[PDB]
Ligand binder design. Structure first.
Ligand SMILES: Cc1nnc2n1-c1ccccc1COC2
Length: 210
């Protein structure tokens, strides 16, 4: 059937849709379709191109209220070289004193960042197990364990200057802790002389792996 209304969604509304590139873009909801128990949402992107999307691949074009964001909530967030995209992830932390009132996001590709409320958008129809549409099995299983074990979160305590081994492309590299920010650590890879922010509970940090 063709619907005009479905839950709080209405045909003609502005919305965000996931493109094939895996980045999210503004568009208009032009149709809602049912096929038995299933629902699909037709989006016309601002470039005139159209996709027929599952409800976990559209997001509201507003910032979620804080009382609607939980650990494990499925969101689209602002993602950082010198460019900014909108990319899907999972809420890992909500605002508290220790994180300076920010949200910790674990993005689907394995990146992590702190963001503000104004950098988040809620996915319209998240899966019951919100991690189940994370493409990479290793990423997906990590999130399942993290979200379900929460608030039990083993983490390594690290200090600036500390020498550790950090994983990259499947092997261990000599690295140094450059700075710490809440549950994230900035690691300098010593051979390459570039940095990455990594979650302190990541098994990419050799002390966590052990
Ligand atoms: C693996 C892994 N180790 N620490 C993290 N992850 C992860 C899994 C899935 C999505 C995002 C991340 C990155 O931040 C959290």
């Amino acid at each position: 059937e063709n619907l005009y209304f479905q839950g709080d969604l209405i045909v003609s509304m502005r919305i965000l849709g996931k493109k094939r590139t895996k980045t999210w873009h503004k568009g208009t909801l032009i149709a809602i379709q049912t096929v038995g128990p299933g629902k699909k949402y037709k989006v016309k992107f601002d470039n005139k191109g159209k996709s027929l999307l599952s409800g976990n691949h559209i997001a509201y074009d507003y910032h979620p209220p804080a009382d609607k964001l939980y650990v494990g909530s499925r969101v689209v967030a602002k993602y950082k070289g010198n460019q900014v995209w909108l990319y899907a992830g999972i809420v890992a932390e909500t605002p508290n004193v220790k994180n300076k009132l920010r949200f910790l996001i674990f993005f689907d590709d394995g990146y992590a960042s702190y963001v503000t409320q104004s950098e988040l958008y809620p996915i319209c129809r998240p899966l019951k197990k919100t991690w189940e549409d994370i493409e990479d099995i290793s990423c997906r299983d990590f999130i399942e364990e993290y979200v379900t074990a929460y608030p039990n979160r083993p983490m390594v305590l690290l200090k600036s200057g500390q020498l550790i081994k950090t994983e990259w492309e499947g092997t261990w590299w000599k690295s140094r802790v450059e700075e710490v920010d809440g549950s994230l650590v900035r690691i300098l890879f010593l051979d390459d002389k570039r940095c990455e922010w990594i979650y302190r509970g990541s098994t990419r940090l050799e002390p966590m792996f052990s």
